[PDB]
Design a protein around this ligand. Sequence first.
Ligand SMILES: [K+]
Ligand SMILES: [Mg+2]
Ligand SMILES: [Mg+2]
Ligand SMILES: [Mg+2]
Ligand SMILES: [Mg+2]
Lengths: 188, 438, 46, 179, 232, 177, 112
Amino acid sequence: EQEVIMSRMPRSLEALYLQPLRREAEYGVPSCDLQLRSYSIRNLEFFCDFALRAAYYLGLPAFGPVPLPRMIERWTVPKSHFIFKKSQENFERVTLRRLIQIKDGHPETVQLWLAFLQKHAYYGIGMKANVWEFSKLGVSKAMDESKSEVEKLLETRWEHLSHVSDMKGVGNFEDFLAKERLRISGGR
Amino acid sequence: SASVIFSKYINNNNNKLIPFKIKNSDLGRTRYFPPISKEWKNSIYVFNHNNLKNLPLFDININSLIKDYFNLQFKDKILFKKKRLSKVKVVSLNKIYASKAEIKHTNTKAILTVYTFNREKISLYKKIKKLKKSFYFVFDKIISFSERVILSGVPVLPWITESHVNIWRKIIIASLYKELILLRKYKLRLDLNKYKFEEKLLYRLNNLIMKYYNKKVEFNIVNMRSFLLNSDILTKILALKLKNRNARVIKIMDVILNKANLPKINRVQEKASLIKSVDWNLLENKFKNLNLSFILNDASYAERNNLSELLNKLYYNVLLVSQKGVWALRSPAQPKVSSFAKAKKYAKIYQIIFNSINYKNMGGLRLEIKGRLTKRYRADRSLFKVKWKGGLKNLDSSYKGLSSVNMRGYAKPNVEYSIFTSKRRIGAFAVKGWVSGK
Amino acid sequence: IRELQKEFGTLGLEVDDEVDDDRLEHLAALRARDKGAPKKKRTAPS
Amino acid sequence: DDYDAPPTEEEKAFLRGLEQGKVTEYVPKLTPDTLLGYGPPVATDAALGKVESAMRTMRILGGGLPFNDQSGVTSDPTAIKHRYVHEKKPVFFSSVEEKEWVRESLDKFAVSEGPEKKTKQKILETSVLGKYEEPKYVESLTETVKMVEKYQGGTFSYAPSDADKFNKKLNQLLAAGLP
Amino acid sequence: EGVPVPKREDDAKLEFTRPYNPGEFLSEKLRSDDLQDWERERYERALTSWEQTPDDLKRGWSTMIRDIEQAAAPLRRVVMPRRSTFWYEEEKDTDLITNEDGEDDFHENDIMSLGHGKLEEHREFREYARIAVWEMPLLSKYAKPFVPPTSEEVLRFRYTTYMGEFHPADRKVVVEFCPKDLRDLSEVQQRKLMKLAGPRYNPEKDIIKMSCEKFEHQAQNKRYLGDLIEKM
Amino acid sequence: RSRFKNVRAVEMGLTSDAKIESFTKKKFAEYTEDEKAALAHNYPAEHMEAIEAAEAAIDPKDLTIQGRLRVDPYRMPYIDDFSEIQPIIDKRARRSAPPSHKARFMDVDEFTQDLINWADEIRRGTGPTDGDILSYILERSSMTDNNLQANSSLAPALPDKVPGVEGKYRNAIDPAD
Amino acid sequence: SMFRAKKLDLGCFTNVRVLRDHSKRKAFLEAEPERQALRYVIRNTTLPARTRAVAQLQLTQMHAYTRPTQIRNRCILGGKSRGILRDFKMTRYNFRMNALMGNIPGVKKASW
RNA sequence: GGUUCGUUCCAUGGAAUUAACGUAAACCCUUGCUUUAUUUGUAAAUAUUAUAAAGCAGUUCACCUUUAUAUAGGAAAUGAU
Ligand SMILES: [K+]
Ligand SMILES: [Mg+2]
Ligand SMILES: [Mg+2]
Ligand SMILES: [Mg+2]
Ligand SMILES: [Mg+2]
């Protein structure tokens, strides 16, 4: 046994004390438009960096964070619950938002990025991602062929859902999902 | 070839190149950005605001549910306490006081933060200790003594089955019944107080709160050492004390202030301003050109190009036995940890983390009581009392002149306001309370 | 609270409904000084 | 009569372990299987997007709760037994550990291993294969019934049950306004 | 019914009313009040063994339980509250009452509630610094390189995601293609496609953009646009 | 067409791509086989899998063309591997088993057997040491769950002398009073 | 009267008129597709004059609770209907107090 | 008794020394500049509108005048900015 004089620390730990590295896009065609939103700047600015670091490891060249126009709502209410209207005051809810656009990104790889961000989401931040993908003609035919490919991947995932034989509480399958999603989503 | 649709998004390349400019101006250190969860009780943003309108109403129900939860207590018949079934309304102060909950929302879960002042454990833990150590020592002798008399011959073996143990266990209970109940009472009351913060009972409260937000709720209960470090716990304790008709209002406030210790200060240095001078120790002013290529390129010192060497000269490293020394690793179930985790000393890190936090020391205290607090049961005029100790100002901005970050556009970041409403036999009264930090 | 007293009632734990307890104490104090509510009339006035 | 000695140093050092905590281990683990359930439910050609849209449909049948696989395995058994038996509706589990905790917390409670075959097809039918009912083109304007079906089939505001209530009253009026 | 009456018809009956020794306890138990005959023999065997021991060997036992009583003596002592008491002013539960000395001192081992929000915020930065150093690098093992779309991939669909949220707008699917990408259509056939497209055609960019949010699932909105483009 | 500027690259003398490589291999050289063995002997297998992947992903050419120092207010104020979970500065760990739903509070009969069982575990190494009696009042579960130590949601406590708070307060109460 | 549920299913501030307006929202949710068909037959000038008069007479016999114009937002905390904000379901005043104390996320006092 | 937008600051009093609130400071918007970011915004571009995070900036310097020599003030399109 001896002691080795380590020349440097692991690059994973060094990269944490550098600015988020960025890949280079050869073509520059957008593949994802992730828009984050919070009512507080601090949470948003932190997570925007945490997202760019994850995009570098996945080979996704990220561009941003682009500061989009902050959304400002306004209300003027009287300070009293009664006659005294000559005195009012203004309130607001400023929405601060950023944009991280990913260009020249593989469709599947871009989905792992969004999965990693949702699993490790920072509180107080809402996210919305638009995904683009190229596909050939004859969309209907492709969907049918994929069936067996998707079935094999769900073989081990069917365990999540379990119900009694001939579930009667559901009734009409489609009308259930349609109205269950309405209840889950608050009403719309 | 290539698609025409694919070639219609390449030409749209008018992006600006990153310049890597060199700073020629001095930069001051950034403000102290206070935590986010302290501006609004619900730190949330949702794209469908249907999940955002009912929160003000739920938090009234959640706080009503966490209060009744921390007050849970055994039924006097479970502990053999022989309740005195009196028609009185006993006011209990030796319980767990909880504050208003603060939730950190995400699309997957909700972290509920509540600050508690456990006053019941301070009493239970003291009395369970009063039991002399000889109890457990002498009790151990009865176990061995009872195994040589009942489960043996005359002056765990295969011929000693379990059915015989049942009768062997009742003889010990028959002779120590009045004592085994005493120890059981204090242990159960302690474990209950302990499980209220563990998953043994929280998983039941989660099922109740989970029906409001439709997400699994995680708890971050923070145990407070003193009840003066929180405005919610302070105004509630003082309110329970004042609910008695015979309560001396003016006297109960002085007893609380006398318990509030403030740090000694220098009135001249505390109120002294701060001159604005370039801090050349800041990493922004040290290396105006942040690029590694310029720095590590034998700028001033020789053969320090190693990036790790540069970082060690800027941050406090734990992996190094010596502060600026080299990193030495030993050359060639149990927990999976590094072979040097024990050598790591978080002595100065605790000094870096806790020095980066403002509003730690309590430096201000104000109490206001207003309403019908007279003794005689008649129609009298309202009463109002106010007591304070220290200041509620922001020293970093009012005197030093530094820039602060006000909460909700108007509130000071260092003060905690809370109001508690109660009622006497003659009317309603409120207890307001401010608590500032230095 | 009613669903909180039942979820934990199986463990032998009890809590008081202060909001409803004082309500009963108020109603009981009214009957003492002859101020409670009259007997609910369940038929037409005749 | 009463004098409790100060906390001994051996006692203090013990309380710190419970209050401050101890040096626990941490094992990194990240594979596409650990991220499945959090991905985007997009109808992309990539199978990862189709497998996620089927899980989202399973979560709507199970109650609609988010996919949380890192907040424990506890739940409300008395409420899951009612939904699973008395209401006869599906139940969605985030992990197998959460399924074996409901069994151990209920006396003689049996849950099926996955859904039935007929339920596996109905999930892939619309959520993956996207099989719809094409709204035909109605030329004449006097075809009231056919025109209503055309519009009802081109908007998700009219659920199958909301359309039935409409077509019921409509046919009741068209039949009551004839010779 | 009627005015509620109190509920005093409940109490916890103590099994034993006085300390019984092995001899007296077994004697009463062996009295055959309510006990199984096949179980009584287990008791008689114990009663005989107990009596067979040296008499004074019980003196040690009887004196053993007496010392445990003295060990638990200070645990049942009713402590009188301090004259000027704050926490036990009217505490009727004599169990919790104690000396009340030193329970209010500040040992300089806690910060205000405001300081805990900044401390918990650091425990979170370490949680993400732990993810960025140990879990992120594993993402590179499952990444795939980007490949440009071939000549056949002429459509460019768009799908919306809200990352765990349920929004009515996450069902719309937009598709945009270029009439000149379809090399099977001649000049006149391409110009007729720009006319049938109607307002969906952008003369400046020369792209036919069209969306669909008619159905409940994104899959159905994409299949309709896939069939519609085959009709166009 | 690249993404960054060359103004900061041509300043040091990296005009030639071949010269950029001399700046990487000289300063961002990959770990030596000797260091990998020593680095893999201290960290577990799961940790080394992330280090070997971080050096294959983060190419040294990027650290030279765009590698910049972090000066944002969200950077960590110290260096650390963040491999383990520390007592105070980290969130409390949750490595215990889930609680039993059928578990109930022990009674006089079950409590006695639990107490007897505890006297048999410590008596396997005289008599119960206060160190064990203290580990019985605060750790011994009084529920019918086979003595399960469940995960605690209580936040980690702070040091007995908080930096910035200690050395500023005086006890007003005296023993002579 | 007949639309009021025999078991209260309201968890907010209950009131005589809050309970009345909640029954009109449930009655309209069940009869909206039926009411939309009657309004479609009345405005369809291609149908016989008799079909339109029948639908026009049945739409008048519908209970008042079925009309959507009877619905009016109320304060979930106070139960008032004058001066309500759709974004918070509360009066202008209840919104002020809760916004100052921090119970309404994102809202702060505006100054500019 | 002077001075200051100001119980502001200085001097002084055969009685003062201090604390809290308001005031002040700080905060939000706005003005100039610096750094970061370049999409859904910008003709091009070696980057200059816009967008928005952080940081700096004033009565600061120069000139003139100046009580009790302690505190300072004036000048306002033709000093800098
Ligand atoms: K439909
Ligand atoms: Mg009367
Ligand atoms: Mg003076
Ligand atoms: Mg663009
Ligand atoms: Mg600008």
